[PDB]
Amino acid sequence: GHMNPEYDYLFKLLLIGDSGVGKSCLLLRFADDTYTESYISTIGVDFKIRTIELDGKTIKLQIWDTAGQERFRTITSSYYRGAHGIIVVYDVTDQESYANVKQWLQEIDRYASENVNKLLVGNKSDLTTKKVVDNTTAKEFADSLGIPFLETSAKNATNVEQAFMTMAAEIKKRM
Amino acid sequence: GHMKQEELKRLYKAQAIQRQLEEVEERQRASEIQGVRLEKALRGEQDEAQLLQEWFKLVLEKNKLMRYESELLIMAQELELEDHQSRLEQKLREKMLKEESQKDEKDLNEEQEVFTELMQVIEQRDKLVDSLEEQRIREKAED
Numbered sequence: 001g002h003m004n005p006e007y008d009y010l011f012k013l014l015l016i017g018d019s020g021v022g023k024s025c026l027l028l029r030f031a032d033d034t035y036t037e038s039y040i041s042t043i044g045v046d047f048k049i050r051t052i053e054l055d056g057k058t059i060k061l062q063i064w065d066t067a068g069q070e071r072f073r074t075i076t077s078s079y080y081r082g083a084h085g086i087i088v089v090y091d092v093t094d095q096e097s098y099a100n101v102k103q104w105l106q107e108i109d110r111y112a113s114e115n116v117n118k119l120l121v122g123n124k125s126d127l128t129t130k131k132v133v134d135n136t137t138a139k140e141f142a143d144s145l146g147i148p149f150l151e152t153s154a155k156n157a158t159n160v161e162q163a164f165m166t167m168a169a170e171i172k173k174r175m
Numbered sequence: 176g177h178m179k180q181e182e183l184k185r186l187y188k189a190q191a192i193q194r195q196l197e198e199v200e201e202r203q204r205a206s207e208i209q210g211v212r213l214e215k216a217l218r219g220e221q222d223e224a225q226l227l228q229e230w231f232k233l234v235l236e237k238n239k240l241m242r243y244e245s246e247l248l249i250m251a252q253e254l255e256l257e258d259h260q261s262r263l264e265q266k267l268r269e270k271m272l273k274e275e276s277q278k279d280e281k282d283l284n285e286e287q288e289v290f291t292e293l294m295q296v297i298e299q300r301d302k303l304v305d306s307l308e309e310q311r312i313r314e315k316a317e318d
């Protein structure tokens with residue numbers, strides 16, 4: 001916590017999506033490189049900070065984690081407006097969470113800035129035998145929207161770093 | 176488990192900030208003493224060109240120590256907000272595990288209060304990020 005800041009850009013990111021899809025674990029894996037099997041539902045909101053490097057630019061990411069339960073929708077909606085980028089997370093083993101992605105996209109249109117960047121993430125790719133959302137259908141949806149799409153595992157860390165880097169590069173190009 | 180490790184890491188890092196701070200304030204104590212010894216010597220109570228070179232370095236050093244102390248104070252503040260947030264969260268999680276039947280009207284009032292303090296601490300952490308950013312923008316504009 002300096003007086004003279006050694007970063008070039010500050011990007012504010014937001015994680016949204018159904019409860020239990022792994023939003024908090026993705027943040028924990030990215031910001032702290034750890035992982036808990038405990039299901040500790042998020043109370044309203046929280047954020048962590050991680051600094052990254054992109055084309056010679058040092059970029060501070062402020063990443064907001066939100067409760068997915070509908071019950072918290074009023075509380076979490078205040079936080080959409082200031083986001084540079086919003087990541088919508090679903091669970092590849094959970095068909096209904098993918099189904100709800102259309103709803104989460106409408107929450108973004110209602111509450112976020114007009115030009116906010118968006119990224120679609122299917123989490124829990126480690127659960128091989130339990131996967132039910134074909135990445136073909138997810139990818140083809142994302143593409144019809146001009147949205148980038150990635151599958152991740154917060155548990156074994158696959159693609160987690162790449163997900164946030166991809167989001168940051170999209171913002172940088174825009175901003 | 177996961178929560179204990181996080182607490183341990185937080186505690187070690189507060190402790191280490193505190194250590195650096197303690198050393199800085201000691202060096203500030205010593206530099207101030209050297210400061211009056213130099214004044215006395217220049218005022219006539221070795222070589223005075225040499226004293227002046229010493230006085231010059233003391234001035235630079237007081238500035239260095241000041242900027243170091245101020246950086247550490249901000250870090251310590253940031254860490255206390257995080258520690259405060261964590262205890263609020265655990266206090267709230269515990270109240271919530273209490274089943275609703277035995278839940279007195281004063282319990283509901285305390286949940287609301289703990290929740291309010293938790294969101295305010297989070298808001299203080301966020302405004303600290305926004306303050307740093309403002310400062311970045313100003314320094315860039317000055318230079």
Ligand SMILES: Nc1nc2c(ncn2[C@@H]2O[C@H](COP(=O)(O)OP(=O)(O)NP(=O)(O)O)[C@@H](O)[C@H]2O)c(=O)[nH]1
Nearest residue numbers: 019020021022023024025037042068124153154155
């Ligand atoms: N196998 C596997 N389990 C995961 C993965 N990510 C999260 N989980 C598990 O799924 C559960 C939900 O985690 P969590 O991150 O809390 O979900 P959430 O989206 O934050 N929920 P909420 O919105 O209520 O706070 C936890 O038991 C967690 O360990 C993953 O990549 N693989």
Ligand SMILES: [Mg+2]
Nearest residue numbers: 023024041042
């Ligand atoms: Mg969560």
